[PDB]
Ligand binder design. Structure first.
Ligand SMILES: Nc1ncnc2c1ncn2[C@@H]1O[C@H](CSCC[C@H](N)C(=O)O)[C@@H](O)[C@H]1O
Ligand SMILES: Cn1c[n+](C)c2c1NC(N)N[C@H]2O
Length: 291
């Protein structure tokens, strides 16, 4: 077995301390071990992001605009969590597909069946005004062309919506499929426990200060780096059993999950962080119907 002692998991991309040549054969290997793993991946990352904003005092009173939200089953838990905490938030979930019915009948959450384009972003910006906006984008068209298009849309979301913070889907196009260099917003490249086995996707977290917008250029050389670093993370790291991690499940992803969950705010007082995390994890798994 693959046992190890780790102080902490890699929380952000920049922390990954090694790389591996990508093996195309890994694409044929099982991508998911848990039912509803995708909803879990999203729930952990979004809970982490939103808790950070709470920590900085910018969540309460904002309207969370989530684009690419359907089905969005996990969003009900996110909404309940902050709603039960006392935080005041309006949710506006926009997608061309239908949302999970469990999202209906909540006055604080508005569902919109529309694929957004630049023009629509402007109308909703006029309609939300003057509320503070928090953007979460999980739009998926794929080809590098599809990706660039999505990234180009996500940048437009930020320029038009002008949010106080954003969480964006971010997967660098593959080096052998480069088309052109492009810019993405500057942010923390948050790694995602429970992402597909060989997924190179992460979430770009950003907080906007002043009236500036900093972007960063991404080149094919960056793409080769993303490829090698995420390959090492997936093939080696995520397959480690953290023996010094005293917890019911010692797999790397649960170790990573623990670290994201220890930052989440709860009403109930716990004697230890271990107790809080166990509580949240149990609550989460129960909600998603994961054993
Ligand atoms: N311009 C656009 N506007 C809104 N939604 C879009 C879009 N382009 C793609 N999408 C949506 O992006 C979604 C990608 S999957 C999103 C899953 C969702 N975040 C959840 O929590 O389950 C699809 O629902 C797709 O319809
Ligand atoms: C097809 N896939 C999948 N996958 C994750 C990768 C691919 N192609 C690449 N050139 N690099 C990768 O990181």
């Amino acid at each position: 077995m693959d046992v190890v002692s780790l102080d902490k998991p890699f929380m952000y991309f920049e922390e990954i301390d090694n790389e591996l040549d990508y093996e195309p054969e890994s694409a044929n290997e099982v991508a998911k071990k848990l039912p509803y793993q995708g909803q879990l991946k999203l729930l952990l990352g979004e809970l982490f992001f939103l808790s950070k904003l709470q920590r900085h005092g910018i969540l309460d009173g904002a309207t969370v605009v989530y684009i690419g939200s359907a089905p969005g089953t996990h969003i009900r838990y996110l909404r309940d969590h902050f709603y039960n905490l006392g935080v005041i938030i309006k949710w506006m979930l926009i997608d061309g597909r239908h949302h999970d019915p469990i999202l209906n009948g909540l006055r604080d959450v508005t569902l919109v069946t529309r694929f957004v384009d630049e023009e629509y972003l402007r109308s909703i910006k006029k309609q939300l005004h003057p509320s503070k906006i928090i953007l979460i984008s999980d739009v998926r068209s794929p080809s590098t062309a599809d990706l660039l298009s999505n990234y180009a849309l996500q940048n437009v979301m930020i320029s038009i919506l002008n949010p106080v913070a954003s969480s964006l889907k971010w997967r660098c196009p593959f080096p052998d499929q480069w088309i052109k260099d492009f810019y993405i917003p500057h942010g923390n490249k948050m790694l995602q426990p429970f992402a597909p086995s060989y997924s190179a996707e992460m979430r770009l977290l950003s907080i906007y200060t002043g009236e500036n917008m900093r972007l960063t250029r991404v080149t094919k050389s960056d793409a080769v780096n993303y490829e090698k670093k995420m390959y090492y993370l997936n093939k080696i790291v995520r397959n480690k059993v953290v023996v010094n991690f005293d917890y019911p499940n010692q797999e790397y992803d649960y170790f990573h999950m623990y670290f994201m969950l220890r930052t989440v705010y709860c009403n109930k007082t716990f004697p230890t962080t271990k107790a809080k995390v166990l509580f949240l994890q149990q609550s989460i798994f129960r909600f998603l119907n994961i054993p």
